[PDB]
Design a protein around this ligand. Structure first.
Ligand SMILES: CC(=O)Nc1nnc(S(N)(=O)=O)s1
Ligand SMILES: [Zn+2]
Length: 257
């Protein structure tokens, strides 16, 4: 019964998922002055030309856009990664106000939302096996700030009305995720976890330095979604973000000076 409420929120998760108090939990605050520039880090290789989106679903916590990951169609390579990682889904995290919504923070600064592009290491055969490994997933995090509209995001925004409640899904084909990327691919990277239960510590996080801009109207439509299922009391899907966790024995590395 976990969620983002006062009676089932992040502060409570540890009761069902003890790893919540683990050594490599996410998200975290990225202190730009203590981050270490690593010249050995290679540029990111994002190959989304052949991406095949299939649907969009409201899972009661966020909305996910799912892709066909039965072959190497949309993959992430390079950067701090060893091997090929396939894109399986993307989702966002957002707030009830423009001043909050992101999971990671930069020098304590919070963004309006955060986009997560989830990929799994193909050496493990399937997603379920990948999450059990320390190098099983790679999540690309992109911050969203409110300003000018993002044309490439409008297609997602327009279909939200069709998946307002938990459990609803809609066909969502031919969506090109390349339209959601910023101009630069400079990033920070650190070993972490999933930010929602089971909170497994199987993620190599890659957080882009350059945020993308979205309009107030676009983010407002995110806030119209529901955590609840149809026929149940309406609870607006807002503030579905986990606060920063202690860095502990970890070092954040930057690909840029
Ligand atoms: C099936 C799946 O993708 N689960 C995830 N759980 N948490 C994720 S996150 N918030 O770290 O990107 S992805
Ligand atoms: Zn996420």
């Amino acid at each position: 019964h976990w969620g983002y409420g006062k009676h089932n929120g992040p502060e409570h998760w540890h009761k069902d998922f003890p790893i919540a108090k683990g050594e490599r939990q996410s998200p975290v605050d990225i202190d730009t002055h203590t981050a270490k520039y690593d010249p050995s880090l290679k540029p990111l290789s994002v190959s989304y030309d052949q991406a095949t989106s299939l649907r969009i679903l409201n899972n009661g916590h966020a909305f996910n856009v799912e892709f066909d990951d039965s072959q190497d169609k949309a993959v992430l390579k390079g950067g701090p990664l060893d091997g090929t990682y396939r894109l399986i889904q993307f989702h966002f995290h957002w707030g009830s106000l423009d001043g909050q919504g992101s999971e990671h923070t930069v020098d304590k600064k919070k963004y309006a939302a955060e986009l997560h592009l989830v990929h799994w290491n193909t050496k493990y055969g399937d997603f379920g096996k990948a999450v059990q490994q320390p190098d099983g997933l790679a999540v690309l995090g992109i911050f969203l700030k409110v300003g000018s509209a993002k044309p490439g995001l409008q297609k997602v925004v327009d279909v939200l009305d069709s998946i307002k409640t938990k459990g609803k899904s809609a066909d969502f084909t031919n969506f090109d995720p390349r339209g959601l990327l910023p101009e630069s691919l400079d990033y920070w990277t650190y070993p972490g976890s999933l930010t929602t239960p089971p909170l497994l510590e199987c993620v190599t996080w890659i957080v882009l330095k350059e945020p993308i801009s979205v309009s107030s109207e676009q983010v407002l439509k995110f806030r119209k979604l529901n955590f609840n299922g149809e026929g149940e009391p309406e609870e607006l899907m807002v503030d579905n973000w986990r606060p920063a966790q202690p860095l502990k024995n970890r070092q954040i590395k930057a690909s840029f000076k």
